[PDB]
Design a protein around this nucleic acid. Structure first.
Ligand SMILES: [Mg+2]
Ligand SMILES: [Mg+2]
Ligand SMILES: [Mg+2]
Ligand SMILES: [Mg+2]
Ligand SMILES: [Mg+2]
Ligand SMILES: [Mg+2]
Ligand SMILES: [Mg+2]
Ligand SMILES: [Mg+2]
Ligand SMILES: [Mg+2]
Ligand SMILES: [Mg+2]
Ligand SMILES: [Mg+2]
Ligand SMILES: [Mg+2]
Ligand SMILES: [Mg+2]
Ligand SMILES: [Mg+2]
Ligand SMILES: [Mg+2]
Ligand SMILES: [Mg+2]
Ligand SMILES: [Mg+2]
Ligand SMILES: [Mg+2]
Ligand SMILES: [Mg+2]
Ligand SMILES: [Mg+2]
Ligand SMILES: [Mg+2]
Ligand SMILES: [Mg+2]
Ligand SMILES: [Mg+2]
Ligand SMILES: [Mg+2]
Ligand SMILES: [Mg+2]
Ligand SMILES: [Mg+2]
Ligand SMILES: [Mg+2]
Ligand SMILES: [Mg+2]
Ligand SMILES: [Mg+2]
Ligand SMILES: [Mg+2]
Ligand SMILES: [Mg+2]
Ligand SMILES: [Mg+2]
Ligand SMILES: [Mg+2]
Ligand SMILES: [Mg+2]
Ligand SMILES: [Mg+2]
Ligand SMILES: [Mg+2]
Ligand SMILES: [Mg+2]
Ligand SMILES: [Mg+2]
Ligand SMILES: [Mg+2]
Ligand SMILES: [Mg+2]
Ligand SMILES: [Mg+2]
Ligand SMILES: [Mg+2]
Ligand SMILES: [Mg+2]
Ligand SMILES: [Mg+2]
Ligand SMILES: [Mg+2]
Ligand SMILES: [Mg+2]
Ligand SMILES: [Mg+2]
Ligand SMILES: [Mg+2]
Ligand SMILES: [Mg+2]
Ligand SMILES: [Mg+2]
Ligand SMILES: [Mg+2]
Ligand SMILES: [Mg+2]
Ligand SMILES: [Mg+2]
Ligand SMILES: [Mg+2]
Ligand SMILES: [Mg+2]
Ligand SMILES: [Mg+2]
Ligand SMILES: [Mg+2]
Ligand SMILES: [Mg+2]
Ligand SMILES: [Mg+2]
Ligand SMILES: [Mg+2]
Ligand SMILES: [Mg+2]
Ligand SMILES: [Mg+2]
Ligand SMILES: [Mg+2]
Ligand SMILES: [Mg+2]
Lengths: 122, 120, 52, 56
RNA sequence: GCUCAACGGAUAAAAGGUACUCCGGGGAUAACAGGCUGAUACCGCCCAAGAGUUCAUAUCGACGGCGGUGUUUGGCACCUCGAUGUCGGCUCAUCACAUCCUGGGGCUGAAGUAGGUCCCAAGGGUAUGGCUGUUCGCCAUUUAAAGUGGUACGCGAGCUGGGUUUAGAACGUCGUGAGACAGUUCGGUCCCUAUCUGCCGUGGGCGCUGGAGAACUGAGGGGGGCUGCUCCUAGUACGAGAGGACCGGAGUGGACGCAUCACUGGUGUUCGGGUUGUCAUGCCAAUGGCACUGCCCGGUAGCUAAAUGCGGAAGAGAUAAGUGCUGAAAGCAUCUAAGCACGAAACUUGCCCCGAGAUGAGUUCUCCCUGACCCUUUAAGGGUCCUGAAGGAACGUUGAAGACGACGACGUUGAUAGGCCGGGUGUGUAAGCGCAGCGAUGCGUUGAGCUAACCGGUACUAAUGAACCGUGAGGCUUAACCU
RNA sequence: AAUUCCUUGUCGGGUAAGUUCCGACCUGCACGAAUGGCGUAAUGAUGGCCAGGCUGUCUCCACCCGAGACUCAGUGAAAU
RNA sequence: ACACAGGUGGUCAGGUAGAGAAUACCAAGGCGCUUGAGAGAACUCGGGUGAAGGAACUAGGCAAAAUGGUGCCGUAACUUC
RNA sequence: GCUCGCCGGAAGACCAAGGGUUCCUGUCCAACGUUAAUCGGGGCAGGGUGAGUCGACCCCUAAGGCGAGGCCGAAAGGCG
RNA sequence: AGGACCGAACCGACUAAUGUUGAAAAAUUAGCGGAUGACUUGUGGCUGGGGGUGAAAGGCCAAUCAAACCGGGAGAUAGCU
């Protein structure tokens, strides 16, 4: 359950440390965000000379939720720590190159083909 | 609601119910028949029968578990020596509920809970 | 409040107690701020004229 | 939350319509002594279902 | 001899504050709302110069005019001053259509996509936050859209009290001063168990025409009615390119509602275990009590969500705006006058629920009762003895039923509940003893012991045989068939 | 500014967004020097604001334990 | 006003843990509060716990939740030192 | 009478203050006790408080009061 | 040493909830401030109605205060109800 005001981690090679979800994109009155939903975040903390900077607003996709994602057999892949991957605001095109932190098979939907390809595990 | 929640609250603390049903089970064993309301009778039936169930087999271990419950050796001595042998072959209801009347004070439907086989 | 449709400048006034009285003052202040916008566009083209 | 007009005796009686008591009226005679008592209740001295169950 | 100029002159002679206020009265007179009105406000329309490259009416629209609405600011005091409590927020809404989105169309300065405008349409839906006490508004990020209003600018006998109009204090300003300010600032008691109406649920009585037990039809009514994106059609139609469909059909989500615990989790003070302090069980050992369940860690059933299924519809009838056929009045033309055919999430059904107190009280099936004597102003009368049926109720053991009644199951011709037994689940290697060790403690016996409402069996305990109520073939008139 | 009506003034900082807040400019409606002016370490059940932590305050409640509520027996009010 | 959760000066004041007359559990002594018994709805009050998030609540972090002891290390701006 | 639960720097045990028989015994239940009531700080009758050492009184005195004469004041009276 | 610090008694009363025909005509529960002093408290006195007293609110002076309570003037007066 990633919703507004949720402080996510970052899981790519872009520069940020703590982001904060400010809007769950997708629909009216939409409560939370889940598996691979696109969300709008803001950057609260970064590395000094990196690409993104503090106080910037761009999109993201959730990858690892603390509540976890259900597989069709009744199994759950409960992670430990909320994390996301920064995206370009104007297109799919993830700004990262080194996606750390193993992601889920539930992102394999052809618009995130670059995400799974750069991912270490699962 | 309370769908399938077999247990009666009796308008008391949970710490009161563990000590009320401890002393009332104790005076049922020392005596043989006591007088109380039905909602205490239907519930004391749920505590005293698991003692007569217990004392059918004597052991050091069964004396302890029968001493954690009822907390007095005199009841423990009344158990394992009297009741265990007196209810040995019977497999089931070791006590009987029997409705009598009402109290003058608060009009509570009362009943005489009694241990079976008291024709001595 | 007096909000200009093409421009977007807002002109509010809550000095007096009547809506009829605050209307003319807000119309007056809007009349000032719209004409003074025209005097800056007159100077903006004038300043670019001097830049050549 | 008080009241507005005083109700009548009519309203006071129609409300006590269902407050009316009801008796048992159908007792059981025991097999031994026959002393009438309530169904599923012991007698005055200890008889029940044709048996002295008070044992005293 | 008096600007006794307030000039029929109350004295020869007289200024203000009160938010510390009090008293007597007033809706004779204000503030809040309602009411009458409709200048202003808001909406629509009329004539039409001009703008629009050409062209008044694609879209706007000068100089002027005519109305509507009761949403603004006001006017009038009609209503209340032996009380009508006030903005905003929370909650719960409900109706109107001058409609923000979706739906159906005309026109276009409509190629396509995307828009502008007007008409029909109210079924449903109709943001989260930063700042302000604010509604509004500005801003950020969305969404199919984040409509406009009525409803005491809905809602304080439902909540809050931030703002504002009690008592304290200060600053700026005004005044000699007390004090004062559509200036400001910090702080400051929000009462009530619901008689009636209304509404949400649930029963008792009686009626329904002999009574009773079940199953339905069905008038009436309520609930439900939202929608995005991706893909196929096709990157076809259109287009110099750039870009990029209608229609039709699949799949996957958000919001909302119904339902359910098999899954994932939550709680689980009736289950198991760990541990601190202290008292007690004669003492060690082993336990119990108390300290919010002492604090904790897990956890059965049940309940429930964030979990899991499902739902809106299709189709039909009759229509709105609108589009056509044939076609006269008017030789023509023309959707309309006769007649005919299409045409929306709206209307009536289709889906689901309530439902014969629908007093117009329905229908079908089945079961049970076919006993004798008197009086009488002799009538659908009253009374007595003999039987009191089907069934119901009461009582009892209780339910995943439930505030209480009620409703469902069962009542030994027994499985309804408690207990017991097997199993399962949970917690976790109990107690006692033996061995190792100075000891705490560990290992072995042992995945054992204990096991809550869980599952399947079993009459051991309790549901005692009776009694109570309810009856004895069911009126009058008439018609139609049997005789 | 406990002071600025105009006004949420303008510029800068904090925030994705800041009518409040901090620094500054000076057009001070209507600051100002014992009805004291400007600073100031500490202090404060003081006013405003921000961050970390933390959590049912909230998204959106769910369950549980007790006292009333509900039923029965006794007593038995009140405003109106 | 009552057999009223209120007010009322001084003195004595044990054991274990603890810095303590704090506080917990007990001793001696004194009491269970002068209505009770069932049922286990909504709702109200006193409390417990909680998935993911963590002020998004709101006038305002109000209330809760949290921090909490001893020993030691270490401890900024500014300052009237 | 037997278990249980509460207090235990008090809800324990003594005095002052202030009340005034509420103390104890026999007996009674209408009224009083927010219920019943055999019971009770309730009704009726009876009994109960024993001091050279405790307290008061008493001796002395503070704040202060009264105050022979006296001063003062229409009187009352004030002050000492 | 200190109108020093943390913190019971004692005193005081800032926040919230409950309660507001309450248990109580201002209290209770969970927190909170002071807590060797400008402190608090017992007993006994003194100051009094246009007067007392006041770390000053026009607060307090027997549940009453921008002028207490009781009796008398007095059946005040009331163009008001
Ligand atoms: Mg009770
Ligand atoms: Mg306990
Ligand atoms: Mg009644
Ligand atoms: Mg004159
Ligand atoms: Mg003032
Ligand atoms: Mg008045
Ligand atoms: Mg008006
Ligand atoms: Mg032209
Ligand atoms: Mg015009
Ligand atoms: Mg109106
Ligand atoms: Mg008006
Ligand atoms: Mg008039
Ligand atoms: Mg009116
Ligand atoms: Mg188009
Ligand atoms: Mg908000
Ligand atoms: Mg807003
Ligand atoms: Mg309101
Ligand atoms: Mg308050
Ligand atoms: Mg129908
Ligand atoms: Mg319908
Ligand atoms: Mg082509
Ligand atoms: Mg496309
Ligand atoms: Mg679980
Ligand atoms: Mg637990
Ligand atoms: Mg336990
Ligand atoms: Mg021990
Ligand atoms: Mg104990
Ligand atoms: Mg703790
Ligand atoms: Mg758990
Ligand atoms: Mg009829
Ligand atoms: Mg039956
Ligand atoms: Mg059988
Ligand atoms: Mg069973
Ligand atoms: Mg072991
Ligand atoms: Mg154990
Ligand atoms: Mg077992
Ligand atoms: Mg700024
Ligand atoms: Mg000046
Ligand atoms: Mg000054
Ligand atoms: Mg001066
Ligand atoms: Mg000063
Ligand atoms: Mg300072
Ligand atoms: Mg202070
Ligand atoms: Mg903030
Ligand atoms: Mg009653
Ligand atoms: Mg009492
Ligand atoms: Mg008392
Ligand atoms: Mg001690
Ligand atoms: Mg003792
Ligand atoms: Mg409860
Ligand atoms: Mg908690
Ligand atoms: Mg706090
Ligand atoms: Mg706490
Ligand atoms: Mg203590
Ligand atoms: Mg006596
Ligand atoms: Mg009595
Ligand atoms: Mg007496
Ligand atoms: Mg002597
Ligand atoms: Mg003297
Ligand atoms: Mg002389
Ligand atoms: Mg003299
Ligand atoms: Mg304290
Ligand atoms: Mg006088
Ligand atoms: Mg006179």
């Amino acid at each position: 359950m990633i919703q507004e005001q949720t402080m996510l981690n970052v899981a790519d090679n872009s520069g940020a440390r703590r982001v904060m979800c400010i809007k769950v994109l997708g629909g009216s009155h939409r409560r939370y965000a889940g598996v691979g939903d696109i969300i709008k975040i803001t950057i609260k903390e970064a590395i000094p000379r990196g690409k993104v900077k503090k106080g910037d607003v761009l999109k993201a996709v959730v990858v690892r939720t603390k509540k976890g994602v259900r597989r069709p057999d009744g199994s759950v892949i409960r992670f430990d720590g909320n994390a996301c991957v920064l995206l370009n605001n104007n297109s799919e095109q993830p700004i990262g190159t080194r996606i750390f932190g193993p992601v889920t098979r539930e992102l394999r939907s052809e618009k995130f083909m670059k995400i799974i390809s750069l991912a270490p595990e699962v | 609601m309370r769908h399938r929640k077999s247990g009666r609250q009796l308008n008391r603390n949970s710490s009161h119910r563990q000590a009320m049903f401890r002393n009332m089970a104790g005076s049922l064993v020392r005596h043989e028949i006591i007088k109380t309301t039905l909602p205490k009778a239907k519930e004391l039936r749920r505590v005293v029968e698991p003692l007569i169930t217990l004392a059918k087999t004597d052991s050091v271990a069964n004396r302890r578990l029968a001493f954690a419950r009822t907390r007095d050796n005199e009841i423990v001595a009344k158990l394992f020596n009297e009741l265990g042998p007196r209810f040995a072959s019977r497999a089931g209801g070791y006590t009987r509920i029997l409705k009598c009347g009402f109290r003058a004070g608060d009009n509570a439907p009362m009943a005489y809970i009694e241990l079976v086989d008291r024709s001595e | 409040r007096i909000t200009h449709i093409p421009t977007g400048i807002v002109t509010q006034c809550q000095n007096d107690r009547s809506q009829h009285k605050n209307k003319d003052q807000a119309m007056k202040q809007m009349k000032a701020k719209l004409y003074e916008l025209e005097m800056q566009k007159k100077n903006a083209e004038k300043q670019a004229m001097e830049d050549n | 939350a008080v009241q507005q007009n005083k109700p009548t005796r009519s309203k006071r009686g129609m409300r006590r319509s269902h407050d009316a008591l009801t008796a048992v009226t159908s007792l059981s005679v025991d097999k031994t002594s026959g002393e009438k008592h309530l169904r599923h209740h012991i007698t005055a001295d200890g008889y029940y279902r044709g048996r002295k169950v008070i044992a005293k």
